[PDB]
């Protein structure tokens, strides 16, 4: 404590001018620049390096003192210096100061509204920041401990508008967050999931451009993997579109369609007793006698999920005595 208190005080006077205390009697954040300008002239612009170095220790060196109060400094120090690094590092430092149970899962006034405020601020800077590389990971580093606070409809409404964003990775992780929340507060999640599922299923067949088809198909993949509650009753409409998508427009659309089909089969499982008789011929048609040497990894993996999930294992050789002929010469 003779040295760690000193380094915390140096970090203090670098950030804003006071001393770190927990509860004995504090100030706001306006005199930071006035406290820090005299600091370097006391020993001997950009000033990014000093703040970056001072932030690089809060994520590294552990302190046994109370550690959930100077977040009220750090989060207000988000856009203090404009950068693609300062904002990102400050946001991830605030995110890594709340990992599993510090002020997170304890329930009381001034133990809950502080968490609500910091999570709201993090989501606001997560969906507001223009530079489109902060939000590829500031949403991703949201651990499963903030679920009871961000599962409320007030935050959820602002959250699911991130399902339509610029970079496709944002959609890929946001739909996974939605699928995870699909068992926390399902009353305000599941109908919205139905709405976006219907929207994607309409676009997947009424759109006519391969990259849009790609994005819709793999968004459906990650949604059907990340949420099993909205999965089973919609198997017929979700198969009636994907099943006639083994065309020759491109290899990637067919590979992703087969990936959708395999994921749907492994998610559902054992109710395809009245789909398998039609499902097997169409998949073996694209499994054998390819027109072009395309990527058959998806064509293997779709059967890899579906046969095992169905349990129709010894039968297919007897009903379709050709699959031996495919397997002997595909090698």
């Amino acid at each position: 404590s003779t040295v760690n208190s000193r380094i915390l005080n140096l970090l203090s006077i670098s950030l804003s001018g006071e001393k770190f205390i927990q509860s004995n009697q504090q100030f706001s954040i306006e005199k930071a620049r006035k406290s820090r300008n005299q600091s370097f002239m006391k020993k001997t612009i950009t000033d990014a390096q000093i703040l970056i170095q001072c932030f690089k220790m809060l994520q590294l060196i552990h302190h046994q003192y109370s550690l959930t109060e100077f977040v009220r400094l750090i989060t207000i120090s988000y856009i203090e210096h404009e950068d693609s690094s300062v904002r990102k590092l400050a946001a991830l430092t605030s995110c890594d100061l709340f990992i599993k149970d510090d002020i997170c899962k304890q329930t009381s006034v001034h133990a809950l509204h502080s968490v609500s405020e910091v999570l709201s601020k993090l989501l606001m800077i997560a969906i507001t920041d223009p530079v489109a590389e902060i939000r590829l990971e500031i949403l991703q580093h949201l651990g499963s401990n903030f679920d009871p606070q961000l599962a409320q409809p007030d935050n959820l409404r602002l959250l699911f508008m991130a399902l339509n964003d610029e970079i496709f990775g944002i959609q890929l992780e946001a739909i996974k967050i939605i699928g995870r929340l699909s068992s926390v507060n399902p009353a305000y999640v599941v109908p919205s999931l139905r709405k976006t599922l219907l929207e994607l299923l309409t676009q997947l067949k009424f759109s006519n451009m391969p990259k849009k088809k790609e994005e819709s198909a793999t968004l459906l993949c990650t949604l059907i993997n990340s949420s099993d509650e909205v999965a089973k009753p919609y198997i017929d409409p979700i198969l009636d579109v994907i099943l006639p998508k083994c065309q020759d427009a491109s290899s990637a659309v067919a590979s992703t369609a087969l990936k959708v089909l395999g994921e749907l089969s492994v998610v559902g499982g054992k109710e395809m007793t009245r789909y398998l008789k039609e499902l097997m011929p169409l998949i073996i048609n694209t499994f054998q006698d390819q027109s072009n040497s395309f990527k058959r990894d998806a064509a293997l993996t779709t059967l890899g999920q579906l046969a095992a999930s169905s349990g129709y294992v010894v039968g297919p050789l007897l009903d379709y005595p050709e699959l031996l002929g495919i397997l002997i010469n595909i090698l």
Partner: peptide
């Protein structure tokens, strides 16, 4: 109002 979606889902569940 956002709440009508649950009523639509209720119809979907019964009609299935």
């Amino acid at each position: 109002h956002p709440m009508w979606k649950s009523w639509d889902l209720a119809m979907d569940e019964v009609l299935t």
